[PDB]
Nucleic acid binder design. Structure first.
Lengths: 118, 130, 118
DNA sequence: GAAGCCACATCCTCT
DNA sequence: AGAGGATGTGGCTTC
């Protein structure tokens, strides 16, 4: 649970947390490295256990019937808004394309280090 | 009814035409979802083809313009100003023969313009209908 | 079906909902009827705007005249008309010279459109 | 409070 | 597996 990714992204409490912000929050929590993690390339990440990520998302949003099939459509909505793109050819691998550096204040190498990514 | 009987008067009266009889601000309504450059090369080239899409920002009334008499030259001028483009195009708006005239910044893609009765077309038209 | 006079003495059109959702397919295909004689194949085109949006984003706003009828295949409004405010249609029939017919307060477009009181 | 704007949550069709 | 259309739903804001 390193830097407060949720906050650095803009989240303040007002209104639900957005899917991309929640994911980012999971990527900055060393304990979640099992189901979600950085691929070690820029801001690209992989959902190793989509069903798990979906549950926690379902839980955090209070939509118990949630699931990856649905969570992904959420991500797909970002393609156009340039927040997160899909790593073509790599299963469950997406990438933040917004300016996470400016928000988090750290760079990919920096964060990967702090999070001890292997 | 290709045109309205009181063609002459319907332009003199009626708020519609009236509100659009002065140097009202106008703008190029095209490819708004595209880079400014593109809208520039597009808007101008398209003018060289004698056509353009413009609306009166104020009233928000859009209009498709065709710069020809009822490959152009005087209907679409780019000499009367170093950067602007003076245009002109007739039409039968709501049963009233009129002529749209105005200019636009070849950069800011906007300017001024307005409408003015077209005694000729109106008269000729009144004929075909009798 | 049922037509309606426009601000031009030479053209009529189908009826459009008073309030509708944006980018939402219409309930009744919009068509433009020409009282006078208009050569088949003639292009017809609609635009919209108001004192809040000078030019509404549209979709499939073009149709060709056929038997005095220009049937617009899936016309859609994407630009919003504003709270309370509506759009002023500008139907254009390309003849020599072109004939333009307006239609004030024709349709109100919003993000949700018609919604049941929450 | 209605009416707006947002960000999904649900469902589904196609490749 | 993944893209994207269609439409309903709850949070928050503005008129």
């Amino acid at each position: 649970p390193v830097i407060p990714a949720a906050a650095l992204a803009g989240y303040t409490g007002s209104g639900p947390i957005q899917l991309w912000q929640f994911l980012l929050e999971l990527l900055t929590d060393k304990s979640c490295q099992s189901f979600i993690s950085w691929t070690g390339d820029g801001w690209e990440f992989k959902l190793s256990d989509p069903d798990e990520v979906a549950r926690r998302w379902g839980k955090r949003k209070n939509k118990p019937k949630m699931n990856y099939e649905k969570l992904s459509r959420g991500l797909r909505y970002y393609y156009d808004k340039n927040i997160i793109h899909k790593t073509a050819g790599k299963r469950y691998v997406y990438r933040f394309v917004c300016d996470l550096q400016s928000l988090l204040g750290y760079t990919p190498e920096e964060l990967h280090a702090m999070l001890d990514v292997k | 009814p290709r045109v309205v009987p009181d063609q002459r008067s319907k332009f003199e009266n009626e708020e519609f035409f009236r509100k659009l009889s002065r140097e009202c601000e106008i703008k190029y309504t095209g490819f708004r979802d595209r880079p400014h450059e593109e809208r520039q090369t597009r808007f101008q080239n398209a003018c060289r083809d004698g056509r353009s899409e413009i609306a009166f920002v104020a009233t928000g009334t859009n209009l498709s313009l065709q710069f020809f008499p009822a490959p152009s030259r005087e209907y679409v001028d780019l000499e009367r100003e170093a950067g602007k483009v003076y245009l002109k195009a007739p039409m039968i708006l709501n049963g009233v023969c009129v002529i749209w005239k105005g200019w636009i910044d070849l950069h800011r893609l906007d300017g001024m313009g307005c409408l003015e009765f077209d005694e000729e077309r109106a008269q000729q038209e009144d004929a075909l209908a009798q | 079906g049922e037509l309606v006079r426009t601000d031009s003495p030479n053209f009529l059109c189908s009826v459009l909902p008073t309030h509708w959702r944006c980018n939402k397919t219409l309930p009744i295909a919009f068509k433009v009827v020409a009282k006078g004689d208009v050569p088949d194949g003639t292009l017809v085109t609609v635009m919209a705007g108001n004192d809040e949006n000078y030019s509404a984003e549209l979709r499939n706003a073009t149709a060709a005249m056929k038997n005095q009828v220009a049937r617009f295949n899936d016309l859609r409004f994407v630009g919003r008309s504003g709270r309370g405010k509506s759009f002023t249609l500008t139907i254009t029939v390309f003849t020599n010279p072109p004939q333009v017919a307006t239609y004030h307060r024709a349709i109100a477009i919003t993000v949700d459109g018609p919604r049941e009181p929450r």
